[PDB]
Design a protein around this ligand. Structure first.
Ligand SMILES: [Ca+2]
Ligand SMILES: [Ca+2]
Lengths: 204, 204
């Protein structure tokens, strides 16, 4: 009986890992497509399956990080959203922390997304008239030329500036979508999605 | 592009159906074993996957009903839990409504579980000192000999009675667990669980 219970728990862990990969692929697709409601529902499903997983492989941690990163980016303009125990950390700052934690290549695209998130983390505060919060976000992020221009913009208390239109929220989203395309290609061959696709194709 | 999006949505529906069956099996096992925390976490996962399903087969509706029924039975003593739009309906009354809706055989076990839920729906109100609510539950349920004894017990305002010790909450749970064993046997051959079990066995 105890041996059977042990084998059953192991089988549940295997199935949960397959569900995590499928839900990550679905979340990536909803993010890339801009399907907001599908993204919300898939986020709910991914969070629940994650709470049922105990021990994680390095790949499973990476998959969870990718899900957490996309969730924070989708909430980047929601300054009332608290993703960290420290209530001062804004959603884009939380996304930056995960982006720097993922075991992935630090290629040119990685650094471009990183710098666009840093700029937008300040921009979103400015756009809401939260000037003191923009200065606090600036101090945490940098804790020279790029930094100096940002501080000057914050000091000018301009709710809008040409610099943010050049390094825009849309530009950040498009660069992140380029990265999401690579994750989609890499996880499209995962077990559950492959099996489901074969069934759908078999009925054509 | 639209054809690809259509095939992807169909594949997601196939995968969601497989996840629903696996989560139902896991919920049944947690209920049978009395693993309260695993039941809560699996309930959360099942609810999320269900919200991602649109069109349902008759079997998928039955599976959802089985999940909903077990959730109400697990919450049978939680009189603050509201499962229906009508806030007056108690959890055991909600379980009775689903039990009468499931497309299943009405064998002797079916009627025994039905009658034990009717008795306990009144008993749980009595045990909390909710005498007027017990009389209201009685009126909704019956809306002769068994009914007459129950009304007399409610009128005597006895928070405890030998009848409820004979037709007890534990007896209701044990009869329901006998039914859950049949559901477990029937759904153990579902795709995700079979594939996960084969992997675990392959590594032995
Ligand atoms: Ca805030
Ligand atoms: Ca109540």
């Amino acid at each position: 009986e105890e041996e059977d219970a042990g084998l059953v728990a192991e089988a549940e862990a295997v199935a949960a890992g397959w569900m995590l990969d499928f839900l990550c692929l679905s979340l990536c697709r909803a993010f890339r497509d801009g399907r907001s409601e599908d993204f919300r529902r898939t986020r709910n499903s991914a969070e629940a399956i994650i709470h049922g997983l105990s021990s994680l492989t390095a790949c499973q941690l990476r998959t969870i990080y990718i899900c957490q990163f996309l969730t924070r980016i989708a909430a980047g303009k929601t300054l009332d959203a608290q993703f960290e125990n420290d209530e001062r950390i804004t959603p884009l700052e939380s996304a930056l922390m995960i982006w720097g934690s993922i075991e992935k290549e630090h290629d040119k695209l990685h650094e471009e997304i990183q710098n666009l998130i840093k700029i937008q983390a300040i921009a979103v505060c400015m756009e809401n008239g939260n000037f003191k919060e923009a200065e606090e976000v600036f101090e945490r992020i940098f804790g020279m030329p790029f930094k100096s221009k940002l501080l000057m913009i914050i000091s000018q208390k301009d709710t809008f500036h040409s610099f943010f239109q050049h390094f825009s929220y849309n530009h950040m989203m498009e660069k992140i979508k380029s990265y999401v395309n690579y994750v989609l290609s890499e996880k499209s061959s995962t077990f559950l999605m492959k099996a489901a696709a074969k069934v759908v194709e078999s009925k054509r």
